[PDB]
């Protein structure tokens, strides 16, 4: 229910330190592994944590987000602005962790995959990154469900 997740919403929204955000994200993580449907309440707040400055809560935010989007494909379009912001972010760690999760998100979205892989290429091209492996894997799998 949405009533029992209100303290978790408050702790995730008001988390200032890395310790508080990490512990509340992990606490969401065990009962998301138990109850995967609870993650729809945390959607935009995971989108806010998606572009976090430090690495562990940002990786956990990507993990919990992609787990939320594995259930409902309609959630996939709602994560497009934050994912393209993470690809085009000035922080390089955020760009790397967006590129690592790029094929999974491209598989999960599939109507915004042209713009996504184009952004990944242009980040790799005008940056100094090599997303050709991720882009190639995403293109291969997208072709595999394209021929179906």
């Amino acid at each position: 229910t949405a009533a029992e997740m209100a303290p978790y919403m408050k702790r995730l929204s008001r988390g200032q330190t890395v310790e508080d955000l990490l512990e509340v994200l992990s606490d969401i993580d065990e009962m998301s592994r138990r109850r995967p449907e609870i993650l729809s309440f945390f959607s935009t707040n995971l989108q806010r944590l998606m572009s976090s400055a430090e690495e562990c809560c940002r990786n956990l935010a990507f993990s919990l987000a992609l787990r939320s989007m594995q259930n409902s494909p309609s959630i996939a379009a709602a994560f497009l602005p934050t994912f393209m912001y993470c690809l085009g972010s000035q922080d390089f760690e955020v760009v790397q962790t967006a590129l690592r999760n790029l094929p999974e998100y491209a598989l999960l979205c599939q109507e915004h995959a042209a713009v996504l892989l184009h952004r990944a290429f242009l980040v790799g091209m005008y940056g100094q990154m090599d997303p050709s492996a991720q882009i190639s894997e995403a293109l291969r799998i997208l072709h595999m469900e394209a021929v179906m």
Binding site: A2, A3, T44, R48, L80, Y85
Partner: protein
Amino acid sequence: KIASVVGILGHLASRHGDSIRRELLRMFHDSVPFLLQLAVMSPALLGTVSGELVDCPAVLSQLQQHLQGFPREELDNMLNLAVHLVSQASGAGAYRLLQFLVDTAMPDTVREACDRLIQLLLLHLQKLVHHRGPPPRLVPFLDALKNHVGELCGETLRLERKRFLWQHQLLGLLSVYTRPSCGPEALGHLLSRARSPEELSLATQLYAGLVVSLSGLLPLAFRSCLARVHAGTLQPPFTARFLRNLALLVGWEQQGGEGPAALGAHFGESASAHLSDLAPLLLHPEEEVAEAAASLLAICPFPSEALSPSQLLGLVRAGVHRFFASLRLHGPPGVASACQLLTRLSQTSPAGLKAVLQLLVEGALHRGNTELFG
């Protein structure tokens, strides 16, 4: 209390009844408070919420006005039952019934009854959203409205004679009510879709009603808007509208009187945190987006600490590109925003001055932009 026992029996007797209860309510509405009182604790009100708007047309309103011979105290009790039912029963067709109720306020006695219904609903929602300063209250009516916040903003921006007050109050209540704080999203819709200073005033009024209970609204609204801009979302007319409305807000705060002082919005300070996002918008292929970004960046203050060398160099490169593009396209009248931005960037530091002068002279002497100067 035989009515309570009858309702408790009928709640169990109404298992999986999606047509029989609706038919009974349709037959009972031909010739009602007894049904509504027992419908408070049952999901039959939620099921008939969609059917209530479709069934109600003017003949039913005239029949209700004919059945309005009940005493005024009983009428007020029925109105309180109605606002309680619509606040705590409406599950998924809340926006349709809402648009019906607002539409059936603009037989004059039915219009007055609907107006009192909307006013009492807004007061009851104001009670329910924020009280008991304990788990939060769950409002099913406002739970179905967070998915229609964009449509609510669009209907508020129409600025009709009385509907926008109610929809603006409901936007504020929804912004307070949502634990993920949908307020920045509504502020972003209002900023991106406003076309007049009257329409832009709705965003400032919403923020004035929201800053007394919420914090950090403008950075989140700006981040959401610019994330939608830099993706494929927010097609470039709305991007240009958002940019020029933000330029209007920053300029209005800069000409500060009692308005910006009482609001305390810090529009320029919050927009200063997104110069790395606003700077590529000078390079936008759409001309209106580029000139709106130039007009914003000509007056948007720099961050109070300093400009980063990456930020400063990107701003200067985009500024000189905007200067030469507007000189080629619009001529000397169209270069005012780029000239103001470059003049402000040259006064930040000697490095900024050297960058501005070097890039201006190099761009003016390039193989491109040299036909402008003979």
